[PDB]
Write a protein that binds this ligand. Structure first.
Ligand SMILES: [Ca+2]
Ligand SMILES: [Ca+2]
Ligand SMILES: [Ca+2]
Ligand SMILES: [Ca+2]
Lengths: 303, 311
């Protein structure tokens, strides 16, 4: 068979030039799950201009400038994480793909996380002053606790270990932004910025698939390895998550300083840390008390 | 300003960690051409299942087995080129970007060239047999003349010269597929496979922008260089284009062997090679004789993509 004596271009480019290249074959595929995911993410295409964010203006004007600053800072910090994933993380996954279709799906992922970052800009353009926008960017650059999180993960993308890179790529949509996503759902539960929360739900519709898919592909690779190597990877995952939770807690306490929201946001974050672990095929160690989310906030998340 | 004392994440990851990272800023945009390009390519989003390719079955069934094989082979060859560009070429541009928005635009490009590759698959699904599809994949793998073309470009993508990578990136949508795109427009000028040509025009609506944009960013960077280095880069471009034209000629003569289309397709290719040079800010050396296209073919090439097919 032609497929077994040729390589995909990305394999040729970075791994093995001993054989000729094959064009992607969408008429006979290795993994049916790839077609399912491709169809879902492409049919879920959206742009922030299609949501009428201007209808949030009345409830935005109900919020004082401390709350407006918090929202702008929170979203600019999330923009940084999506910029990391769009420009480095998801594209780094292409060359480590198990299948041809996976290579194209990660290109979609990188683009759509781009759209996610773009959508916060749309929200800022509609509601914030130029100075509020600039202040938030200054604050993100100068916040060491914020910066520590992407600084810990980027090395896995630029290093040679495809499994560690995959774990980083799952952790970003699976965990790292949820502490910030707490804020819009907290607000929309109280009738504040309902249209912004519609953008957040379109973002999460994508991110939940990104986390699932990276976790699915992770499990396929690790299942082939020796028991000793599987244990080594499990240990790496739990150790890395433990570190990322430590950094996230420190950041969220600083982000929400004066507002009281940090401890609820941390529980909201840990609920998703559990879901991250579950999507890698591991069990969550976190208790119900540690992951408790208020019904009104959970209602916004699930809608 | 925060912008002048911070770096984008991709710069931090690969080139410079002396300063902290800045989030993309879509509110204060460095180059308005980025926003114009972003808006056009996103508004132009489409998927191949929206186009009714089943209406080509009557004209497809009129074609003999040789013509059906040629089309399947040609399109599978174009699929390979789009696979190279989606999985290697466009994403390699991201880390060499001049602006923040350019990083996101190349992510869009990589995805959409993925869709271009997907679209040939939808055509094959409707028109071709399993055997035709499999034969064409075998043919592409074993065709050395075909393979030589992407093999010439890939090393620039994985090497550390950003300008040479940029040129290779522009050469793909700007030149390399046109020898193949001659075929569907030759056919649709004779009333055959009309719905397939609608897909090709949607593909070209993207590729024309891809070539423009890479050429635009190339020109901005090379304008900052010394006259000597500008001369070195001009020489590299013409040398590389000369190599690629030689390889393209050899491949097209093999592809179209027995049909008599190779000389027309080569002129069609060289017309676009001249446009490739013009989009890099250079003068085309090719004559009107050498780039002559029939008006019935040019009318199919130059026709506007159908807005009905948009997502
Ligand atoms: Ca405004
Ligand atoms: Ca420890
Ligand atoms: Ca509290
Ligand atoms: Ca002829």
């Amino acid at each position: 068979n032609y497929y077994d004596r040729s390589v995909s271009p990305v394999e040729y480019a970075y791994f093995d030039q001993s054989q000729n290249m094959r064009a992607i074959n969408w008429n006979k595929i290795v993994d049916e799950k790839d077609l399912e995911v491709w169809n879902r993410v492409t049919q879920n295409f959206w742009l922030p201009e299609n949501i009428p964010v201007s209808n949030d203006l009345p409830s935005w004007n109900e919020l004082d400038d401390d709350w407006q600053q918090l929202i702008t800072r929170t979203f600019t910090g999330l923009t940084l994480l999506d910029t990391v994933q769009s420009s480095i993380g998801d594209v780094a996954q292409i060359k480590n793909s198990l299948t041809e279709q996976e290579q194209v799906i990660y290109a979609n992922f990188a683009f759509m996380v781009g759209v996610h970052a773009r959508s916060y800009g749309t929200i800022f353009s509609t509601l914030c002053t130029s100075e509020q926008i600039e202040e938030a960017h200054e604050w993100v650059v100068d916040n060491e606790a914020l910066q520590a999180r992407p600084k810990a993960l980027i090395p896995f993308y630029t290093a040679d270990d495809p499994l560690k890179s995959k774990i980083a790529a799952a952790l970003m949509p699976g965990f790292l932004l949820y502490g910030g996503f707490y804020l819009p759902f907290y607000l929309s539960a109280r009738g504040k910025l309902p249209n912004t929360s519609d953008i957040i739900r379109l973002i999460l519709r994508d991110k939940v698939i990104h986390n699932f898919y990276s976790g699915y592909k992770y499990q396929l690779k690790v299942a082939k390895l020796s028991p000793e190597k599987q244990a080594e990877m499990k240990q790496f995952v739990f150790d890395l998550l433990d570190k990322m939770i430590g950094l996230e807690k420190t950041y969220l306490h600083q982000l929400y300083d004066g507002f009281g929201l940090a401890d609820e946001a941390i529980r909201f974050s840990l609920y998703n840390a559990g879901k991250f672990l579950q999507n890698l095929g591991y069990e969550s160690p976190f208790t119900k008390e540690e992951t408790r989310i208020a019904p009104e906030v959970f209602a916004q998340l699930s809608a």
